[PDB]
Amino acid sequence: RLAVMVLRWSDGSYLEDQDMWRMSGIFRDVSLLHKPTTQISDFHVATRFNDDFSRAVLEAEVQMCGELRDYLRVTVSLWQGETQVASGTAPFGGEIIDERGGYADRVTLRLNVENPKLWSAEIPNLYRAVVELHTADGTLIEAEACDVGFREVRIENGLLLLNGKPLLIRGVNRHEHHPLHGQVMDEQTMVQDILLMKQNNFNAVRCSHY
């Protein structure tokens, strides 16, 4: 039995003065997650490019919790459909960062991608990154994953550039609102919103304000 005592008002409310209906409760999903004792505790994916975006390096930093062991490995593999496009495997132990050494519980994988399919609102090309925590011998402990979009966002010479090209933001602010369910969001309503947005020539959304 779980017992949850939810308060409508708190010191947190002083930072939650958005122009919207003030409601309360358990208004998003509740779930139970089982992880192994030795687990992936964090991972960051970065994509860096050469000048004409014909080459990319996917960089994946992976963190573990649990007992550190020489046999532990991380493989990050990149997939386009059912085709594996790149893969990298390494034992734990980051490079030296200061006088006390490095992170024994971290590893950075670097995967080369030639002529990556680039992500934008125009063409949302995605790859799948799978992060496997496993033994040297290849016994899986657990896998996490995410969708990867190869894109670079930067400001240069006073312009916001996506993949080297200046964006024109056809944006809209969107609150999480349903007239029946209040501030509870469902997949159907989210999808309806996205379809309508794109059908009406929007390419951008601001999560106003959370």
Residues in contact with another protein by CB under 8 A are 157-159
Query: Cβ closer to Mg ion: 19 or 82?
Result: 19
CB of 209 to Mg ion, least distance (A): 8
Residues 94, 143: Cα–Cα separation, whole Å = 20
CB of 165 to another protein, least distance (A): 13
CB of 162 to another protein, least distance (A): 15
Distances from the Cα of 117 to the Cα of 54, 131, 146, 163, angstroms:
9, 20, 16, 11
CB of 50 to another protein, least distance (A): 22
Picking from 128, 124, 121, 118, the residue whose alpha carbon sits closest to that of residue 148 is 128
Region 2-41 residues binding Mg ion, contact defined as CB under 5 A: 19
Find the residue with minimal CB distance to Mg ion: 19
Q: Is the four-CA dihedral 124, 146, 44, 207 of positive or negative sign?
A: positive
Residues 190, 31: Cα–Cα separation, whole Å = 20
Q: Which does 19 bind (CB under 5 to 8 A by kind): another protein, Mg ion, none?
A: Mg ion
Task: Please list, in sequence order, all residues whose beta carbon lies within 8 angstroms of the beta carbon of residue 114, skipping any fewer than 6 positions away.
Answer: 54, 55, 56
Q: Which does 46 bind (CB under 5 to 8 A by kind): another protein, Mg ion, none?
A: none
Q: Which does 158 bind (CB under 5 to 8 A by kind): Mg ion, another protein, none?
A: another protein
**According to the annotation, is 137 in a ligand binding site?**
no
Cα 138–chain centre separation: 26
Q: How many residues bind Mg ion (CB under 5 A)?
A: 1
Q: Which does 173 bind (CB under 5 to 8 A by kind): another protein, Mg ion, none?
A: none
Six-digit token string for 199 = 């059908």
Q: Residue 7, exposed/middle/buried by CB under 10 A (0-12, 13-18, 19+)?
A: exposed
Annotated binding site for substrate: 19
Residues interacting with Mg ion, by CB under 5 A? Answer: 19
Annotated binding site: 19
